[PDB]
């Protein structure tokens, strides 16, 4: 199937120079694989998955050096942004970046990403063409004009089309040691007399994406249905449930459906006493 790599980078300032804290996290196929954190005693890129321990000390030293440069870039940018937004000294501020690439099942580049956020809000983003920039804010225009003149987009295009794809191909070869299908069941819960709660659980699944539906007649009952956001069990898998209020006795009339990419086809089930 398809593959991806991402680097999520953050710098956070707090009042009191001291310098900002810089954290970099790498992901391959939406799973953390490397991590740098400037708060560490001896700041380094560290492996975060067993398959990454293959890499020798030359890798870790190269990447650590890059992280130190990125840390400085974030410092300077954070300071520039304070001026752009006429923010005074005395506050907390956040600068974030997402960079990386999507590959198809054929391992060809499908899309490059290069986005920034300030205070948790979109600041500037390289468009899918990898040539032009989207910048909402009036302040972000200063940046966009600068980066048009500096040829920033071509620089990042080169990394996204080259190094990103190259390195992702490498990491995909190094990592051989999936989907986990959900296991669903309905639980019976009492409610205000006459009514009951049927709650459909999905457990043990990976990736997190899943849909739960209740039907009568049927006729999906989105209106009054209750659910929770998909949550990590903590073991690498996810949980979710959906529930509905139902007249007592007439519970065999309602059916829960579970849609997941790991399934050969959707699961259909109901309460079994």
């Amino acid at each position: 199937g398809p593959h991806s790599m991402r680097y999520f980078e953050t710098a956070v300032s707090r009042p009191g120079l001291e310098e900002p804290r810089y954290i970099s996290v790498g992901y391959v196929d939406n799973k953390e694989f490397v991590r740098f954190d400037s708060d560490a005693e001896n700041p380094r890129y560290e492996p975060r998955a067993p398959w990454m321990e293959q890499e020798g000390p030359e890798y870790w030293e190269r990447e650590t050096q890059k992280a130190k440069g990125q840390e400085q870039w974030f410092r300077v940018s954070l300071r520039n942004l304070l001026g752009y937004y006429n923010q005074s000294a005395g506050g907390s501020h956040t600068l974030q970046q997402m960079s990386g690439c999507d590959l198809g099942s054929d391992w060809r580049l499908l899309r490059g990403y290069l986005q920034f956020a300030y205070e948790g809000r979109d600041y500037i983003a390289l468009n899918e063409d990898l040539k032009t920039w989207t910048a909402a804010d009036m302040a972000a225009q200063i940046t966009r004009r600068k980066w048009e003149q500096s040829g920033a987009a071509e620089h990042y295009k080169a990394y996204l089309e080259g190094e990103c794809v190259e390195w992702l191909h490498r990491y995909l070869k190094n990592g051989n040691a999936r989907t986990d299908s959900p296991k669903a069941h309905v639980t019976h819960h009492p409610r205000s007399k006459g009514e009951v709660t049927l709650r459909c659980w999905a457990l043990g699944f990976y990736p997190a994406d899943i849909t739960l539906t209740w039907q009568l007649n049927g006729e999906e009952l989105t209106q009054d249905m209750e659910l929770v956001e998909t949550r990590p069990a903590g073991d690498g898998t996810f949980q979710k449930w959906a529930s509905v209020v139902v007249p007592l006795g007439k519970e065999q009339n309602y059916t829960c459906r579970v849609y997941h990419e790991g399934l050969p086809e959707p699961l259909t089930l109901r309460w079994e006493p």
């Binding site: 680097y7 190269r62 890059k66 960079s99 920034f116 990394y159 190094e163 990103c164």
Partner: peptide, 9 residues
């Protein structure tokens, strides 16, 4: 491997 950023914001 992660990007090396170009010009500052």
């Amino acid at each position: 491997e992660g990007p090396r950023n170009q010009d500052w914001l």
